[PDB]
Every structure is written in C-alpha cells, then in structure tokens.
C-alpha cells in the first residue's frame, strides 16, 4: 500500500479519502499500468489516494490469472488452510479502516460491454469499455448514491471519444440478489462495511496506450465527482502516454548493485552476481516505478515490467561482503572518489588506482587471459572495448566488478557521451 498525499499535513482531511486497486488478475495490464503511471506523473492537492497497484504480485510476475485460483471470489467462505488466507484478511483490514470513503477496482476485460444483444462481442454478459455498481444505494455510505456518480463520470469519458465504437455504458450487477459470484467478490464485502464502491473495466481489444487512455479518463471523472483535486505533467492523448510507458528515462536496482536502465538492455546479461542462502523473492529491489520484479525461471533470473520481460539474468551466487565503501579514479584528466553503486559519464578516458586486497575486472576490456584478473592501473579509451560486452544496444555502457578472497565487494558502471 502506497499513499499519495498533499505535501502539507494539514490538507489530508479538505478532501475525501480514496482506496484505488489493481491487478487481482496478473494478466490485466491496462489497469497496473494506470496505477502505475498515476503514482508517477500527477499530485493529489486536498485529500488522499491510497494505492495497491498490484494485489497478487505473484501472478503478476508469472503473467498468469490466478496461480491459487480466483482472488476476486474468495471474500465470503474460505478454508483457514488456503495459501492465500493471510493475504485476503489484510485486503479486508484495507477496506474496514474507518478513514476509507470509497473504492475503486480496474480490470481489463473481453468484448465490449452493450445493455442490449447486438452480436457475439457486443452483449450484456461481454465486460469491456464499462464502468461498474453492485446497487444504486447504499443505506449509511458518506457518498450513497451511486447512479448518479457513476453517469456523471461516463459523460467525462465520452467527450473524449478515440473512435465511435469505444462509447461508454453503464453496467448494475444486483449483487446481493441472485448472482452467486459477485457475492464472493471485493466490492460486495465493501458496500457490507458501508463503503462506496466502484469497478472500471477497459477492452482486452485495444492496444495497451489506448486501455490506460481510458483508465485514466475514469479516474480523472471519478476524482472530478468526489471534489480530489489534482493535476498532472503532460497532454492526455494516446501519442503522449505511448511515450510516458516506454520511457528512456526509466531505471531499476537489484540489491546494493547499480542502477541501470530500463529500456535498450540486451536481451541477456551473463555471469551476473546475486547473494548466496537467499531465497529469490527476499532480494531487495526499486525503481522509479512501483511494477517492478524479480522471479525464478529453471536456472535464470527475470527482470520483469509488468508483463514485460527487460532481460534475462544468468546468476551465480556468492557471500556478499559489505566493507567496501569508495574507490578513486580518474575521470577526463580529473582524479576523484567514486562510491560503489554509482554511474559516471566519460568523454575521452579513465583509469582505476589500485588497493589492499581488492582486486578490479573491468567487463568489455582485458589485456590477458589470467581468468582471475585485476585492471586496476590502466589509461582507458572508448576506441579499446569490445562492443559485445555492453549492457545497452547503443554500446555506450559497461561494467567494473570488484572481489575480496571468495567474495564479491561491489559494482560501478561507465556511460561514454
Ligand atoms: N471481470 C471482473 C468484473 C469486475 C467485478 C467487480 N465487482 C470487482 O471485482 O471489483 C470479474 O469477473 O470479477
Ligand atoms: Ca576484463
Ligand atoms: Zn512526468
Ligand atoms: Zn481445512
Ligand atoms: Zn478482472
Ligand atoms: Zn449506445
Ligand atoms: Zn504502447
Ligand atoms: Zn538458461
Ligand atoms: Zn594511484
């Protein structure tokens, strides 16, 4: 769970407080891509916006619904020896809190959504390109009606129409009276703690720019209903969110290792060092963006972005000493200290002053074949890499590795401008 706050204290209480949820499903990417990019690029002025932007990060990983079954029908009955208990009972504590007005769930779902038969992908059993209530009411919510919200929210939608089949509809599942599955289901458990709640659903047919284009649309017409006022850096058009979700701009970081970019990686990174005794899903992560992972496939190491797959890891595990703090190099003609974990931009040259009992394997350059080596105390031009050896496509960025008896002491890496 994530908060996105006012940067003053005093403005939390102005405004109403929104629960905001995704990825109950790990193949739904419109709706943890918005998620996503609403954590990133806007700020909440009065108010709050509580966000889990992926609720079964498992599943997610795998690019697979489910992995334990549904999530989304396990509210009502449900086995104290199931894997996923302990999960659910704090999605529950989520939504009982006493300062939680209303929620939002996105998902991506098959067709497009009509209130009357039309063919096979436009019916009333179809999800797509629909916004979603349990009840007209609800007897005791702060906000209880939810009709009028839900209309006023599609009208914002439909102003900004792509292409006239893309039309917004609104669908009343009457859930506490017959259906059997919406009863098992997140929402009717909200309305049953008084809460107001809501379900946006953008096409599975539509190219992903266009699924978060309208996820994004119903969040701004939602937050427009509850008086959360907000604002955001950039244009709303398909063009310019293509180029806010692929950005050159974007980074991970895995352990106490470098940060490195997102996009133009090589499609497999070799002989890469991760910690010993360390099961894969307790090795720390970040990024500037809060989809990111790691998961184990047979032997490799999957860096994952969403459903995207960045690179693949070939691992080997070793102790990881934590002694090393700093080393000295000079950079353009200029001698320095450099932290390890960093990155440094070189125009011309650099070259690396040696140390006690530390030994330094710059990847890409070499000057034997001694398979243990140290290239501390070499002058380093661009003109004397092996290109191969990079870690991006353009061939501008390589990696220095340092080792201490048999254990690894840290990485820094060079960026060529
Ligand atoms: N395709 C979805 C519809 C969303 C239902 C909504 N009430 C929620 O889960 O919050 C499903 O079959 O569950
Ligand atoms: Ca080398
Ligand atoms: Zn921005
Ligand atoms: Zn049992
Ligand atoms: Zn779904
Ligand atoms: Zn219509
Ligand atoms: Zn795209
Ligand atoms: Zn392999
Ligand atoms: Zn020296």
Redesign the pocket.
């Known amino acids: 769970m994530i908060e996105k706050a006012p940067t003053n204290v005093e403005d939390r209480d102005k405004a109403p407080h929104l629960l905001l949820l995704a990825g109950?499903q790990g193949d739904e990417p419109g709706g943890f891509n918005a998620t996503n990019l609403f954590l990133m690029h806007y700020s909440v002025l009065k108010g709050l916006v509580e966000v889990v932007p992926v609720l079964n990060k498992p599943s997610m990983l795998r690019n697979h619904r489910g992995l334990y079954g549904?999530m989304?029908?396990k509210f009502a009955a449900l086995d104290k020896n199931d894997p996923e208990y302990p999960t659910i009972q704090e999605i529950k504590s989520l939504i009982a809190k006493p300062s939680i007005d209303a929620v939002l769930?996105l998902?991506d779902?098959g067709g497009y959504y009509r209130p009357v038969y039309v063919d096979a992908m436009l019916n009333p059993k179809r999800?797509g390109n629909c916004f979603?209530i349990?009840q007209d009411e609800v007897k005791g919510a702060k906000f209880p009606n939810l009709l009028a919200f839900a209309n006023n929210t599609i009208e914002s939608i439909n102003a900004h129409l792509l292409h006239p089949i893309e039309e917004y509809h609104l669908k009343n599942?009457r859930?506490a009276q017959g259906d059997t599955?919406?009863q098992k289901?997140?929402?009717?458990y909200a309305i049953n703690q008084k809460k107001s709640?809501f379900?946006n659903?953008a096409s599975k047919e539509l190219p992903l720019a266009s699924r978060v284009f309208y996820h994004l649309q119903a969040i701004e017409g939602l937050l427009n209903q509850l008086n959360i006022p907000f604002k955001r850096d950039f244009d709303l058009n398909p063009n310019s969110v293509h180029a806010l979700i692929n950005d050159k701009n974007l980074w991970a970081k895995i352990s106490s290792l470098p940060k490195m970019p997102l996009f133009n990686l090589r499609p497999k990174l070799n002989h890469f060092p991760l910690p010993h005794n360390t099961k894969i899903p307790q090795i720390p992560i970040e990024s500037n963006a809060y989809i990111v992972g790691l998961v184990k496939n047979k032997q490799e190491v999957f860096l994952k972005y969403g459903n995207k797959l960045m690179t693949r890891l070939s691992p080997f595990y070793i102790e990881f000493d934590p002694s090393l703090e700093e080393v000295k190099m000079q950079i353009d003609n200029k001698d320095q200290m450099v932290k390890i974990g960093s990155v440094v931009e070189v125009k011309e040259s650099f070259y690396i002053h040696a140390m006690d009992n530390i030994r330094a394997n710059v990847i890409g350059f070499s000057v034997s074949n001694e398979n243990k080596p140290n290239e501390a105390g070499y002058t380093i031009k661009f003109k004397d890499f092996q290109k191969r050896f990079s870690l991006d496509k353009q061939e501008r960025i390589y990696r220095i590795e340092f080792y201490k008896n048999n254990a690894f002491s840290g990485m820094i890496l060079v960026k060529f401008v």
């Open positions: 109950i549904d989304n029908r769930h998902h779902g999800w979603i349990d599942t859930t599955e919406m289901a997140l929402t009717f709640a379900a659903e």
